Amino acid sequence: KIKLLKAAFLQYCRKDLGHAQMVVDELFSSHSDLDSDSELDRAVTQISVDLMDDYPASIILHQLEDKMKAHSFLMDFIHQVGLFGRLGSFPVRLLLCEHAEKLSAAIVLKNHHSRLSDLVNTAILIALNKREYEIPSNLTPADVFFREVSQVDTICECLLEHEEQVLRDSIEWAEVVINVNNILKDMLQAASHYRQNRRTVIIRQHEIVLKVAYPQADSNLRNIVTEQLVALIDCFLDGYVSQLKSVDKS
């Protein structure tokens, strides 16, 4: 229940200062716990994942860096107090920590890139999911577009298709369709190297392969190659993730 995940979230707060007291609330946990593997242990998985979702919901970059460290001393304050079980990945929702890590390095990889064309495709992507409070506070926001940034990729693609419907392709319009290719690419380069330090996502990639195919039909030589070394950089991350899921199941 909510009283429990608010008791370990209170023991992690003390797990930054000292441990002794927190190690006795994990010891009271193991004796007072259910201990029936098949779902009560996925009731404390649904707690460790509800606090990783809240350390991700948390100076907008230096503030999102402070949150990849926080979710790093939260993954170290789980390895010790242990926290050596539970896993409710199932369908759509341990791999869930790594995944929320990878998407916080994605949130810092598009925070490091802030220009007027992506900030516009982001404001179109957030006004579509819901309305924004107009008491200033207009990033228009990120702390919740992080726990769910996967969505600001399938929308900063629909804003390259409406910026391509007006592109009139004409050369400066095929330079704006590559600038986005380069960011979704090195945002997928940032999730790969965060796993080395260990059906909408995919559709938006097979959609920009085909739009990176329509453009090289009209493009100065050198440019048509750099967007080809790019769509080769991206296709090689999809085929690597279907290979890793194969090897996962047998």
mmCIF file of C-alpha atoms in Angstrom:
data_model
loop_
_atom_site.group_PDB
_atom_site.id
_atom_site.type_symbol
_atom_site.label_atom_id
_atom_site.label_comp_id
_atom_site.label_asym_id
_atom_site.label_seq_id
_atom_site.Cartn_x
_atom_site.Cartn_y
_atom_site.Cartn_z
ATOM 1 C CA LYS A 1 0.000 0.000 0.000
ATOM 2 C CA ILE A 2 0.897 3.712 -0.118
ATOM 3 C CA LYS A 3 2.011 3.607 3.511
ATOM 4 C CA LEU A 4 4.842 1.232 2.586
ATOM 5 C CA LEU A 5 6.372 2.947 -0.453
ATOM 6 C CA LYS A 6 6.285 6.104 1.679
ATOM 7 C CA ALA A 7 8.251 4.321 4.377
ATOM 8 C CA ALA A 8 11.138 3.180 2.179
ATOM 9 C CA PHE A 9 11.129 6.552 0.424
ATOM 10 C CA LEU A 10 11.692 7.757 3.976
ATOM 11 C CA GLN A 11 14.478 5.244 4.581
ATOM 12 C CA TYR A 12 16.334 6.279 1.406
ATOM 13 C CA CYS A 13 16.272 9.849 2.674
ATOM 14 C CA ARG A 14 18.140 8.616 5.744
ATOM 15 C CA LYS A 15 20.160 6.266 3.524
ATOM 16 C CA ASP A 16 22.150 9.300 2.399
ATOM 17 C CA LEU A 17 23.233 10.265 5.918
ATOM 18 C CA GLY A 18 23.607 6.947 7.785
ATOM 19 C CA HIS A 19 22.564 3.327 7.295
ATOM 20 C CA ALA A 20 22.096 1.572 10.647
ATOM 21 C CA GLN A 21 18.504 2.814 11.067
ATOM 22 C CA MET A 22 17.593 2.124 7.442
ATOM 23 C CA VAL A 23 19.065 -1.383 7.642
ATOM 24 C CA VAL A 24 16.614 -2.126 10.455
ATOM 25 C CA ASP A 25 13.638 -0.926 8.408
ATOM 26 C CA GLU A 26 14.803 -3.317 5.708
ATOM 27 C CA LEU A 27 15.163 -5.954 8.433
ATOM 28 C CA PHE A 28 11.693 -5.160 9.705
ATOM 29 C CA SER A 29 10.729 -5.385 6.051
ATOM 30 C CA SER A 30 11.992 -8.971 5.570
ATOM 31 C CA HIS A 31 10.226 -10.322 8.667
ATOM 32 C CA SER A 32 7.058 -8.252 8.367
ATOM 33 C CA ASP A 33 7.048 -8.751 4.597
ATOM 34 C CA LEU A 34 4.761 -11.174 2.764
ATOM 35 C CA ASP A 35 7.460 -13.286 1.064
ATOM 36 C CA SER A 36 5.234 -15.032 -1.490
ATOM 37 C CA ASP A 37 7.391 -14.702 -4.616
ATOM 38 C CA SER A 38 4.726 -14.499 -7.358
ATOM 39 C CA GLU A 39 3.110 -11.131 -6.543
ATOM 40 C CA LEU A 40 3.819 -9.767 -3.052
ATOM 41 C CA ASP A 41 7.458 -9.551 -4.184
ATOM 42 C CA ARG A 42 6.107 -7.736 -7.211
ATOM 43 C CA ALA A 43 4.347 -5.467 -4.717
ATOM 44 C CA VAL A 44 7.708 -4.168 -3.507
ATOM 45 C CA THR A 45 8.853 -4.105 -7.107
ATOM 46 C CA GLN A 46 5.899 -1.807 -7.758
ATOM 47 C CA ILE A 47 7.330 0.319 -4.947
ATOM 48 C CA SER A 48 10.969 0.528 -5.995
ATOM 49 C CA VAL A 49 9.670 1.431 -9.438
ATOM 50 C CA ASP A 50 7.259 4.011 -8.032
ATOM 51 C CA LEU A 51 10.209 5.760 -6.343
ATOM 52 C CA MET A 52 12.421 5.564 -9.425
ATOM 53 C CA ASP A 53 9.514 7.224 -11.213
ATOM 54 C CA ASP A 54 9.564 9.940 -8.544
ATOM 55 C CA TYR A 55 13.314 10.533 -8.580
ATOM 56 C CA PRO A 56 12.806 11.058 -12.316
ATOM 57 C CA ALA A 57 9.869 13.386 -11.694
ATOM 58 C CA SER A 58 12.236 15.138 -9.256
ATOM 59 C CA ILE A 59 18.988 25.743 -13.990
ATOM 60 C CA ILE A 60 17.065 23.040 -15.832
ATOM 61 C CA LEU A 61 20.038 20.922 -16.887
ATOM 62 C CA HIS A 62 22.205 21.211 -13.773
ATOM 63 C CA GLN A 63 18.948 20.258 -12.084
ATOM 64 C CA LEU A 64 18.475 17.168 -14.266
ATOM 65 C CA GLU A 65 22.091 16.171 -13.667
ATOM 66 C CA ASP A 66 21.504 16.348 -9.936
ATOM 67 C CA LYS A 67 18.737 13.851 -10.672
ATOM 68 C CA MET A 68 20.844 11.264 -12.504
ATOM 69 C CA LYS A 69 23.107 11.298 -9.477
ATOM 70 C CA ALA A 70 20.120 11.017 -7.171
ATOM 71 C CA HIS A 71 18.837 8.006 -9.123
ATOM 72 C CA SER A 72 22.399 6.680 -8.903
ATOM 73 C CA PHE A 73 22.693 6.830 -5.121
ATOM 74 C CA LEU A 74 19.183 5.361 -5.145
ATOM 75 C CA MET A 75 20.399 2.382 -7.136
ATOM 76 C CA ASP A 76 23.345 2.088 -4.751
ATOM 77 C CA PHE A 77 21.083 2.443 -1.699
ATOM 78 C CA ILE A 78 19.125 -0.481 -3.096
ATOM 79 C CA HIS A 79 22.102 -2.703 -3.888
ATOM 80 C CA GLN A 80 23.290 -2.395 -0.276
ATOM 81 C CA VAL A 81 20.087 -2.512 1.773
ATOM 82 C CA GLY A 82 18.979 -5.114 -0.843
ATOM 83 C CA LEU A 83 16.717 -5.132 -2.727
ATOM 84 C CA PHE A 84 17.960 -8.295 -4.488
ATOM 85 C CA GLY A 85 14.727 -9.578 -6.041
ATOM 86 C CA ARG A 86 11.436 -8.205 -7.489
ATOM 87 C CA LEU A 87 10.743 -7.713 -11.211
ATOM 88 C CA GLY A 88 7.375 -6.669 -12.723
ATOM 89 C CA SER A 89 8.537 -5.675 -16.225
ATOM 90 C CA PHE A 90 5.858 -7.901 -17.825
ATOM 91 C CA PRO A 91 4.303 -5.958 -20.698
ATOM 92 C CA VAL A 92 4.537 -2.167 -21.274
ATOM 93 C CA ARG A 93 5.609 -1.779 -17.606
ATOM 94 C CA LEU A 94 15.129 -4.426 -12.755
ATOM 95 C CA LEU A 95 15.329 -3.562 -16.470
ATOM 96 C CA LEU A 96 12.985 -0.731 -15.497
ATOM 97 C CA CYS A 97 15.707 1.032 -13.529
ATOM 98 C CA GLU A 98 18.174 0.866 -16.411
ATOM 99 C CA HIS A 99 15.436 2.038 -18.776
ATOM 100 C CA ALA A 100 14.630 5.033 -16.566
ATOM 101 C CA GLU A 101 18.352 5.677 -16.408
ATOM 102 C CA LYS A 102 18.729 5.566 -20.180
ATOM 103 C CA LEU A 103 15.856 8.056 -20.576
ATOM 104 C CA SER A 104 17.381 10.468 -18.071
ATOM 105 C CA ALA A 105 20.547 10.545 -20.169
ATOM 106 C CA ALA A 106 18.251 11.185 -23.108
ATOM 107 C CA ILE A 107 16.686 14.041 -21.184
ATOM 108 C CA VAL A 108 20.155 15.538 -20.656
ATOM 109 C CA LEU A 109 21.181 14.916 -24.265
ATOM 110 C CA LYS A 110 18.357 17.096 -25.602
ATOM 111 C CA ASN A 111 18.826 19.583 -22.786
ATOM 112 C CA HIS A 112 22.401 20.041 -23.998
ATOM 113 C CA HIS A 113 20.824 20.725 -27.379
ATOM 114 C CA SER A 114 18.465 23.687 -27.106
ATOM 115 C CA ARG A 115 17.688 25.684 -30.250
ATOM 116 C CA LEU A 116 14.559 27.400 -31.610
ATOM 117 C CA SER A 117 13.508 24.523 -33.896
ATOM 118 C CA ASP A 118 13.475 21.739 -31.301
ATOM 119 C CA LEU A 119 12.007 23.950 -28.586
ATOM 120 C CA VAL A 120 9.156 24.617 -31.018
ATOM 121 C CA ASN A 121 8.634 20.953 -31.846
ATOM 122 C CA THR A 122 8.616 20.308 -28.103
ATOM 123 C CA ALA A 123 6.025 22.975 -27.315
ATOM 124 C CA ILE A 124 3.860 21.466 -30.039
ATOM 125 C CA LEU A 125 4.446 18.044 -28.518
ATOM 126 C CA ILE A 126 3.414 19.101 -25.013
ATOM 127 C CA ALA A 127 0.397 21.217 -25.957
ATOM 128 C CA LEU A 128 -0.890 18.123 -27.757
ATOM 129 C CA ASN A 129 -0.623 15.863 -24.701
ATOM 130 C CA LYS A 130 -2.346 18.459 -22.493
ATOM 131 C CA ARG A 131 -2.514 22.161 -21.613
ATOM 132 C CA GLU A 132 0.273 24.027 -19.827
ATOM 133 C CA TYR A 133 0.012 26.318 -16.817
ATOM 134 C CA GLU A 134 0.586 29.896 -18.018
ATOM 135 C CA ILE A 135 1.975 31.190 -14.719
ATOM 136 C CA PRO A 136 5.252 31.751 -16.548
ATOM 137 C CA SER A 137 6.826 28.315 -15.974
ATOM 138 C CA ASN A 138 7.207 27.516 -19.655
ATOM 139 C CA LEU A 139 9.969 25.139 -20.637
ATOM 140 C CA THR A 140 7.162 24.594 -21.292
ATOM 141 C CA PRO A 141 8.201 21.732 -19.005
ATOM 142 C CA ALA A 142 10.528 18.765 -18.674
ATOM 143 C CA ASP A 143 10.363 16.871 -15.339
ATOM 144 C CA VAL A 144 7.344 14.999 -16.731
ATOM 145 C CA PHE A 145 8.536 15.022 -20.328
ATOM 146 C CA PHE A 146 11.411 12.917 -18.959
ATOM 147 C CA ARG A 147 9.537 10.123 -17.253
ATOM 148 C CA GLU A 148 7.973 10.289 -20.712
ATOM 149 C CA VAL A 149 10.342 11.730 -23.319
ATOM 150 C CA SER A 150 9.744 8.777 -25.629
ATOM 151 C CA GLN A 151 6.791 10.904 -26.763
ATOM 152 C CA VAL A 152 8.772 14.040 -27.669
ATOM 153 C CA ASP A 153 10.494 11.953 -30.322
ATOM 154 C CA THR A 154 7.367 10.772 -32.137
ATOM 155 C CA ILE A 155 6.170 14.380 -32.141
ATOM 156 C CA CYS A 156 9.394 16.187 -33.025
ATOM 157 C CA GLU A 157 9.015 13.946 -36.048
ATOM 158 C CA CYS A 158 5.477 15.083 -36.850
ATOM 159 C CA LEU A 159 6.919 18.597 -36.632
ATOM 160 C CA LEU A 160 9.558 17.728 -39.215
ATOM 161 C CA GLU A 161 6.805 16.433 -41.514
ATOM 162 C CA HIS A 162 4.772 19.634 -41.266
ATOM 163 C CA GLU A 163 8.009 21.613 -41.545
ATOM 164 C CA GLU A 164 8.689 19.453 -44.591
ATOM 165 C CA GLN A 165 5.239 20.025 -46.066
ATOM 166 C CA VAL A 166 6.216 23.696 -46.136
ATOM 167 C CA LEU A 167 9.859 22.895 -46.898
ATOM 168 C CA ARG A 168 8.990 23.200 -50.608
ATOM 169 C CA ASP A 169 11.635 20.629 -51.595
ATOM 170 C CA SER A 170 14.447 24.155 -50.647
ATOM 171 C CA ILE A 171 18.057 23.510 -49.636
ATOM 172 C CA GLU A 172 17.720 25.152 -46.220
ATOM 173 C CA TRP A 173 14.683 22.906 -45.758
ATOM 174 C CA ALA A 174 16.732 19.752 -46.252
ATOM 175 C CA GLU A 175 19.172 21.133 -43.677
ATOM 176 C CA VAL A 176 16.431 21.354 -41.066
ATOM 177 C CA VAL A 177 15.356 17.763 -41.705
ATOM 178 C CA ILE A 178 18.903 16.608 -40.973
ATOM 179 C CA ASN A 179 19.423 18.699 -37.852
ATOM 180 C CA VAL A 180 16.626 16.661 -36.247
ATOM 181 C CA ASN A 181 18.043 13.433 -37.647
ATOM 182 C CA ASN A 182 21.289 14.274 -35.866
ATOM 183 C CA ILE A 183 19.621 14.753 -32.462
ATOM 184 C CA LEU A 184 17.353 11.712 -32.374
ATOM 185 C CA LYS A 185 20.499 9.892 -33.458
ATOM 186 C CA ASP A 186 22.874 11.052 -30.706
ATOM 187 C CA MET A 187 20.032 10.676 -28.223
ATOM 188 C CA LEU A 188 20.080 7.022 -29.213
ATOM 189 C CA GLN A 189 23.881 7.113 -28.959
ATOM 190 C CA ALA A 190 23.488 8.278 -25.366
ATOM 191 C CA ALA A 191 21.241 5.379 -24.342
ATOM 192 C CA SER A 192 23.661 2.894 -25.881
ATOM 193 C CA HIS A 193 26.678 4.115 -23.900
ATOM 194 C CA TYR A 194 24.567 4.228 -20.728
ATOM 195 C CA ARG A 195 24.025 0.484 -21.191
ATOM 196 C CA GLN A 196 27.776 0.042 -21.584
ATOM 197 C CA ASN A 197 28.340 1.702 -18.215
ATOM 198 C CA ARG A 198 25.964 -0.948 -16.792
ATOM 199 C CA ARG A 199 6.110 0.002 -31.460
ATOM 200 C CA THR A 200 5.945 3.791 -31.567
ATOM 201 C CA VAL A 201 9.619 4.317 -30.797
ATOM 202 C CA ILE A 202 10.405 1.966 -33.697
ATOM 203 C CA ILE A 203 7.774 3.279 -36.104
ATOM 204 C CA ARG A 204 9.199 6.805 -35.803
ATOM 205 C CA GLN A 205 12.556 5.378 -36.875
ATOM 206 C CA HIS A 206 11.278 3.467 -39.906
ATOM 207 C CA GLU A 207 9.455 6.683 -40.757
ATOM 208 C CA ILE A 208 12.614 8.772 -40.903
ATOM 209 C CA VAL A 209 14.496 6.117 -42.848
ATOM 210 C CA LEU A 210 11.943 6.571 -45.615
ATOM 211 C CA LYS A 211 12.075 10.363 -45.336
ATOM 212 C CA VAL A 212 15.862 10.190 -45.367
ATOM 213 C CA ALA A 213 15.371 8.180 -48.552
ATOM 214 C CA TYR A 214 13.092 10.678 -50.291
ATOM 215 C CA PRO A 215 15.521 13.542 -49.720
ATOM 216 C CA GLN A 216 18.780 12.044 -51.021
ATOM 217 C CA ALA A 217 16.832 11.924 -54.282
ATOM 218 C CA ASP A 218 17.462 15.667 -54.382
ATOM 219 C CA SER A 219 20.582 16.651 -52.449
ATOM 220 C CA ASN A 220 24.116 17.950 -52.959
ATOM 221 C CA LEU A 221 26.423 14.916 -52.949
ATOM 222 C CA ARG A 222 28.197 15.285 -49.595
ATOM 223 C CA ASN A 223 24.977 16.013 -47.685
ATOM 224 C CA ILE A 224 23.245 12.913 -49.045
ATOM 225 C CA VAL A 225 26.079 10.896 -47.489
ATOM 226 C CA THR A 226 26.045 12.384 -43.990
ATOM 227 C CA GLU A 227 22.345 11.657 -43.651
ATOM 228 C CA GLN A 228 23.204 8.193 -44.950
ATOM 229 C CA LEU A 229 25.941 7.606 -42.382
ATOM 230 C CA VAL A 230 23.286 8.810 -39.970
ATOM 231 C CA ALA A 231 20.402 6.535 -41.018
ATOM 232 C CA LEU A 232 23.061 3.823 -40.836
ATOM 233 C CA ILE A 233 23.986 4.963 -37.350
ATOM 234 C CA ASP A 234 20.333 4.701 -36.351
ATOM 235 C CA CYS A 235 19.369 1.466 -38.113
ATOM 236 C CA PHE A 236 22.331 -0.157 -36.339
ATOM 237 C CA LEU A 237 20.803 0.617 -32.957
ATOM 238 C CA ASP A 238 17.425 -0.877 -33.820
ATOM 239 C CA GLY A 239 18.918 -4.101 -35.160
ATOM 240 C CA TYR A 240 21.047 -4.231 -31.994
ATOM 241 C CA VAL A 241 18.015 -4.067 -29.718
ATOM 242 C CA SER A 242 16.119 -6.802 -31.533
ATOM 243 C CA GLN A 243 19.256 -8.929 -31.274
ATOM 244 C CA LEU A 244 19.483 -8.286 -27.529
ATOM 245 C CA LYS A 245 15.815 -9.176 -26.987
ATOM 246 C CA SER A 246 16.211 -12.351 -29.010
ATOM 247 C CA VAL A 247 19.157 -13.437 -26.840
ATOM 248 C CA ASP A 248 16.968 -12.585 -23.850
ATOM 249 C CA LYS A 249 14.286 -15.096 -24.802
ATOM 250 C CA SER A 250 14.875 -18.739 -25.699
#
